[PDB]
Amino acid sequence: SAHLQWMVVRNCSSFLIKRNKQTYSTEPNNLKARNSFRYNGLIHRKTVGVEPAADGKGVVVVMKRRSGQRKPATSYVRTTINKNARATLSSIRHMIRKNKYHPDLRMAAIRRASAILRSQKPVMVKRKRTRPTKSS
Amino acid sequence: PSRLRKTRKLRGHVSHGHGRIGKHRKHPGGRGNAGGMHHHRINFDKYHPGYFGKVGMRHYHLKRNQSFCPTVNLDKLWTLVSEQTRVNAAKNKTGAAPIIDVVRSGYYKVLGKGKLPKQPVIVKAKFFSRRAEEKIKGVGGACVLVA
Amino acid sequence: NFAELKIKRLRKKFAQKMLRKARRKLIYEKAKHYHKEYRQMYRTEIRMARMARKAGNFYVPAEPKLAFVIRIRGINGVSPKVRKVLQLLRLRQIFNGTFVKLNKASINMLRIVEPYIAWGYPNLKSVNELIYKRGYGKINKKRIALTDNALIARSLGKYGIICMEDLIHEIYTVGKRFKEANNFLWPFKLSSPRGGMKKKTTHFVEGEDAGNREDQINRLIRRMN
Amino acid sequence: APSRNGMILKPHFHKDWQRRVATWFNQPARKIRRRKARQARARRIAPRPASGP
Amino acid sequence: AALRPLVKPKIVKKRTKKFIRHQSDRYVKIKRNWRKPRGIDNRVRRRFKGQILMPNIGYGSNKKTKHMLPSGFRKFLVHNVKELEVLLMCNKSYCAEIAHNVSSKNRKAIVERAAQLAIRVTNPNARL
Amino acid sequence: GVDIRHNKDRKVRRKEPKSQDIYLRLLVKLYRFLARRTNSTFNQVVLKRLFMSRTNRPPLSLSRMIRKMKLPGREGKTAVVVGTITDDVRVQEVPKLKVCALRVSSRARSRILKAGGKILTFDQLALDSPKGCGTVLLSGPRKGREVYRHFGKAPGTPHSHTKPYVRSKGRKFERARGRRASRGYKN
RNA sequence: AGAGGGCGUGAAACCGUUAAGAGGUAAACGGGUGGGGUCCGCGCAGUCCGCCCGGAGGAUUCAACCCGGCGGCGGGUCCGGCCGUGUCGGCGGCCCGGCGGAUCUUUCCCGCGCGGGGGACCGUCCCCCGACCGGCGACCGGCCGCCGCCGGGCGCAUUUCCA
RNA sequence: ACCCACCCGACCCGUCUUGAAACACGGACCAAGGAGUCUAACACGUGCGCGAGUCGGGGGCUCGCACGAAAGCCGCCGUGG
RNA sequence: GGAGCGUCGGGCCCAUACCCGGCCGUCGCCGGCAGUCGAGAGUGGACGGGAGCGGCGGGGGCGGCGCGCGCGCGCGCCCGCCCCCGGAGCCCCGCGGACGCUACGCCGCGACGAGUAGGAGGGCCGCUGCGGUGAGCCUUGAAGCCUAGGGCGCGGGCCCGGG
Ligand SMILES: [Mg+2]
Ligand SMILES: [Mg+2]
Ligand SMILES: [Mg+2]
Ligand SMILES: [Mg+2]
Ligand SMILES: [Mg+2]
Ligand SMILES: [Mg+2]
Ligand SMILES: [Mg+2]
Ligand SMILES: [Mg+2]
Ligand SMILES: [Mg+2]
Ligand SMILES: [Mg+2]
Ligand SMILES: [Mg+2]
Ligand SMILES: [Mg+2]
Ligand SMILES: [Mg+2]
Ligand SMILES: [Mg+2]
Ligand SMILES: [Mg+2]
Ligand SMILES: [Mg+2]
Ligand SMILES: [Mg+2]
Ligand SMILES: [Mg+2]
Ligand SMILES: [Mg+2]
Ligand SMILES: [Mg+2]
Ligand SMILES: [Mg+2]
Ligand SMILES: [Mg+2]
């Protein structure tokens, strides 16, 4: 099941990382990096995962089929969205809400995408803001 | 697992759980079963009634195999045989009654605890109880002595 | 489906609001009666004496039913018979108090704890001030402040006691249902006596604070409540 | 000294027994050695039963 | 213009000084590190007036602001870049410490990545 | 300062099972929920028993389960046992039963199913009856363990019948001064 | 050589000095403030950001829509077929289904009343199709609805970017 | 958190003791070392497996052991406890 | 002419005691939450005929069980409707459900907290080695050492800066 294998995994997984009074989890398709039942990519029959695009521009959503897990090669199905921020969110929203897929997730999936589109903020602009650089 | 044991948690504390009025000295009672009569008597005669004293007859060269006589109760006599002897019987219509060699299964005596199902038998055994005999007859069977 | 249910839910809503109104009105009239009852009690004690005094006579009024009992010394070095009675009056901490109905049994229990308590016959006002300022229910064994009558009712409403006012009338007149209203009240945690005491260790009669001071328990109440 | 209920029990560790403790760390090495030696003896008694007589 | 945390309440501490160990002052062999005394007579262990204090759970921090740095964050000791990307979805509540043992080349690699993701770093201007 | 004894303020009952096994712990998650959300006290009793020790949930023999359902009226029901169902070789004819158990031994399983019996797991019982309706909640004999024969008024304490811890029974292991009248005295 | 032949690292006790501070109730300590130092964070305004909105400037293509393609989800008609649970029918695998049995038979066979193997029988495990039911995350195929991506269409009261 | 000042508080620890700041003992200072272990037997508690059974030893069959002196299996599965 | 003694007033002084409030922990609550109405709860809902301003014309009770935000109603026009959240717009929503849900988690209410000998629990306290595991760290500097540098933790301790 989901729950059974969460019992096996909850405290032992290689992906987990305690330390410094927090805990985290590094398994893929965990938006929110939580060592939670809810937010765990590997356990659930239906899964969401919002990674950045390898291009450096844009976001990828990562659904999981249901067709056939057992066959991880075919299980996840990726989809780049490289659109005008506000649009990107909405496409993710619909993917999640209007497909009735992992409805629990969804707002977390939006915030992730949002943060990713923040990431691709401008590094040069940040440098200018921190230091006035006036009159030596 | 020392990790789990008590001395890890006693570290720091002086007496190590043995108190500081009285201490952990070596052998304050005497070693072992010392004082069975004097000064440990009460424990002996309120948890071991009858430790001290002889009783009964000596027996010099005891050999246990002479007195070997493992028992079995009617309770579970049919257990000795395959269910399909107890089934091909309550059937058959000859009034046959299947044999149960108890000595084959490793019991010499047949004692008589328990209800025996109304279903004839021939019990071969080295020894029988009185009651075990009676019950067997009441089922409509026959006890059989064997050497 | 939809508009039928909605109206049914609105109907329900209203039937509650009506009932709330009703029970409120009962509470309001119950008080008004108790106002008249205490008035009538007060006057008709004076009435009596004046009438004895008109004749060459005396009106010995009733001995009191009910008394407040404050624990006025601490919890160290206290005899086992005292200590037990003090935890049969629920007077565990120092300066805890309880109402206590009087009778041969009860009075003698106070006699066995005399130099450990100050006590006597509370006023009407005393019963109000104690209940309103420091009225705490025992509600599933959790000391809980009587913020609403929904608390009192929930617990004591099986006796006809449905509000703070009813409670005050049960305590003060020592009704049938006193035991159950009095036990419902968690014992009164009062502060220290402002202006101080006279002497903790000696009896009232002989200058101190302990023992029966009858009328004068009300002064002490005000300086502690 | 005995304390409230238990078998009034006699252990036999009064002689110098730790001088004569016999460990079994051999045993695997032993078990093999027998087994080799066994297979050798077969091979020597060529078509004869390994058993014996 | 540094990274503000989500909520920056008033941390309020019950005790600021270190509890120190009895007679750690008098002797170089005794270390400051707290030890409960277990001595049969002991001014300290029996709570006399005027002595060094004994730590209780009484002094405990408020749970909202326990482990809260002055800045408002909690630390999280990042060890390499991959380990940062965890904090991505916290950033407003946790910051990143970089480890002592991390090299001055890849110390740099972490810092700029945290700057993309807006995770505040607690020892950035350092190795150089 | 207040006078209460803080002596028996902490109740010592279990809360969870002490075991770490994952399947039992799932049953606990299920029956916690049911316990709290249903009115059924069956769920509460069952929940309570899932936290108990091996000792404390003794095996229920098939014959004991038979006779308890043979009782008049509890017919067309389901027997429930938080322990295990074992065989009785000293019973023969096994009626067709309905059973819940955390375990049933392989023999006991065969015998029951051969009869036309149904065996249920505890997750299955919940779906079948979440408020424990139409159940016979049994238990194995708690005081079966040979352990208990040493418990009580000590041996050598008049009118006790309490097995002493003895290395080996036989002519000359106890049965002298303090059991015979001939040797000192007897209790 | 801040590794110099008892030389890797080089703690503490203890000593020398350099700098700072103090000094008649032995010192040292707890609590509480003050003063001074040491560094650390600033600010050469820290007025901190983020949504949405209104106005004002500037800039790319859209979104809304259809059209073509791909991928995904979910659905019932269980429609068609694969899939498997409980039941019933085939006694059909039963010898082309094996093990087990103190069930039987030495009508059998082989080896010497016994051993091995058949042969009955019972228990257990497998084929054939039909019917009912849980139609079960155990899958496919079409159809439907919805979503997303790519490309077509749409050139600008739109949809974006930026200040 | 370094130093200094001041007000209040404040006897030296360890220990045996009814009682220790004691005119009771041990202690100049620092470093490293330094004391409830293991085996056997019992009992109770708890966890797991199987359950009228259970069991593994001892022995054997599988390997030159890289990991193995492991791991696996045994009409020995039960002589036997 | 008390700062003495005996008798008595007011007033004021402060303990870790009492009261109110904060914060930490422990205990208790058949505690709550795996996603729903509902605050002395004292029902909800088919569905069929007969009808309608009818209703259920019961206590100075002072009242809880029955009444004045509607039951039928505004719209389509005496007859019909009284409709669907992929949209009632929401203080309750039974169609789907946390920002919250490491269920060894999270949350709420009360109460309480001296301690030798002794017992038990928890230690994301600490040391050394082993199986796993961190696509860990490390000559672009590991361990150790030192530090009037910055912090965290009630604490065991820990983490960073510089050397
Ligand atoms: Mg001890
Ligand atoms: Mg000692
Ligand atoms: Mg002793
Ligand atoms: Mg006193
Ligand atoms: Mg006195
Ligand atoms: Mg041989
Ligand atoms: Mg002492
Ligand atoms: Mg205590
Ligand atoms: Mg060197
Ligand atoms: Mg050197
Ligand atoms: Mg070297
Ligand atoms: Mg100088
Ligand atoms: Mg002595
Ligand atoms: Mg003496
Ligand atoms: Mg001393
Ligand atoms: Mg002296
Ligand atoms: Mg001496
Ligand atoms: Mg000396
Ligand atoms: Mg050392
Ligand atoms: Mg045991
Ligand atoms: Mg305590
Ligand atoms: Mg102690």
Curated annotation (Swiss-Prot), chain A:
<dbReference type="InterPro" id="IPR002672">
    <property type="entry name" value="Ribosomal_eL28"/>
</dbReference>
<feature type="cross-link" description="Glycyl lysine isopeptide (Lys-Gly) (interchain with G-Cter in SUMO2)">
    <location>
        <position position="64"/>
    </location>
</feature>
<dbReference type="GO" id="GO:0005737">
    <property type="term" value="C:cytoplasm"/>
</dbReference>
<dbReference type="InterPro" id="IPR029004">
    <property type="entry name" value="Ribosomal_eL28/Mak16"/>
</dbReference>
<comment type="similarity">
    <text>Belongs to the eukaryotic ribosomal protein eL28 family.</text>
</comment>
<dbReference type="GO" id="GO:1990904">
    <property type="term" value="C:ribonucleoprotein complex"/>
</dbReference>
<dbReference type="GO" id="GO:0003735">
    <property type="term" value="F:structural constituent of ribosome"/>
</dbReference>
<keyword id="KW-0963">Cytoplasm</keyword>
<keyword id="KW-0597">Phosphoprotein</keyword>
<feature type="cross-link" description="Glycyl lysine isopeptide (Lys-Gly) (interchain with G-Cter in SUMO2)">
    <location>
        <position position="57"/>
    </location>
</feature>
<comment type="function">
    <text>Component of the large ribosomal subunit. The ribosome is a large ribonucleoprotein complex responsible for the synthesis of proteins in the cell.</text>
</comment>
<keyword id="KW-0832">Ubl conjugation</keyword>
UniProtKB/Swiss-Prot annotation, chain B:
<feature type="modified residue" description="(3S)-3-hydroxyhistidine">
    <location>
        <position position="38"/>
    </location>
</feature>
<feature type="modified residue" description="N6-acetyllysine">
    <location>
        <position position="109"/>
    </location>
</feature>
<keyword id="KW-0007">Acetylation</keyword>
<feature type="compositionally biased region" description="Basic residues">
    <location>
        <begin position="1"/>
        <end position="29"/>
    </location>
</feature>
<feature type="modified residue" description="Phosphoserine">
    <location>
        <position position="67"/>
    </location>
</feature>
<keyword id="KW-0379">Hydroxylation</keyword>
<feature type="modified residue" description="N6-acetyllysine">
    <location>
        <position position="54"/>
    </location>
</feature>
<keyword id="KW-0597">Phosphoprotein</keyword>
<comment type="function">
    <text>Component of the large ribosomal subunit. The ribosome is a large ribonucleoprotein complex responsible for the synthesis of proteins in the cell.</text>
</comment>
<dbReference type="InterPro" id="IPR030878">
    <property type="entry name" value="Ribosomal_uL15"/>
</dbReference>
<comment type="subunit">
    <text>Component of the large ribosomal subunit.</text>
</comment>
<dbReference type="InterPro" id="IPR027386">
    <property type="entry name" value="Rbsml_uL15_N"/>
</dbReference>
Curated annotation (Swiss-Prot), chain C:
<dbReference type="GO" id="GO:0000463">
    <property type="term" value="P:maturation of LSU-rRNA from tricistronic rRNA transcript (SSU-rRNA, 5.8S rRNA, LSU-rRNA)"/>
</dbReference>
<keyword id="KW-0694">RNA-binding</keyword>
<protein>
    <recommendedName>
        <fullName>Large ribosomal subunit protein uL30</fullName>
    </recommendedName>
</protein>
<dbReference type="InterPro" id="IPR016082">
    <property type="entry name" value="Ribosomal_uL30_ferredoxin-like"/>
</dbReference>
<dbReference type="InterPro" id="IPR012988">
    <property type="entry name" value="Ribosomal_uL30_N_euk"/>
</dbReference>
<keyword id="KW-0597">Phosphoprotein</keyword>
<keyword id="KW-0689">Ribosomal protein</keyword>
<feature type="modified residue" description="Phosphotyrosine">
    <location>
        <position position="116"/>
    </location>
</feature>
<feature type="modified residue" description="N6-acetyllysine">
    <location>
        <position position="101"/>
    </location>
</feature>
<dbReference type="GO" id="GO:0003723">
    <property type="term" value="F:RNA binding"/>
</dbReference>
<dbReference type="InterPro" id="IPR039699">
    <property type="entry name" value="Ribosomal_uL30"/>
</dbReference>
<dbReference type="Pfam" id="PF00327">
    <property type="entry name" value="Ribosomal_L30"/>
</dbReference>
Swiss-Prot record, chain E:
<dbReference type="GO" id="GO:0006412">
    <property type="term" value="P:translation"/>
</dbReference>
<dbReference type="InterPro" id="IPR018263">
    <property type="entry name" value="Ribosomal_eL32_CS"/>
</dbReference>
<dbReference type="Pfam" id="PF01655">
    <property type="entry name" value="Ribosomal_L32e"/>
</dbReference>
<feature type="modified residue" description="Phosphoserine">
    <location>
        <position position="61"/>
    </location>
</feature>
<dbReference type="InterPro" id="IPR001515">
    <property type="entry name" value="Ribosomal_eL32"/>
</dbReference>
<protein>
    <recommendedName>
        <fullName>Large ribosomal subunit protein eL32</fullName>
    </recommendedName>
</protein>
<feature type="modified residue" description="N6-succinyllysine">
    <location>
        <position position="49"/>
    </location>
</feature>
<keyword id="KW-0832">Ubl conjugation</keyword>
<dbReference type="GO" id="GO:0003735">
    <property type="term" value="F:structural constituent of ribosome"/>
</dbReference>
<comment type="similarity">
    <text>Belongs to the eukaryotic ribosomal protein eL32 family.</text>
</comment>
<feature type="cross-link" description="Glycyl lysine isopeptide (Lys-Gly) (interchain with G-Cter in SUMO2)">
    <location>
        <position position="8"/>
    </location>
</feature>
<keyword id="KW-0963">Cytoplasm</keyword>
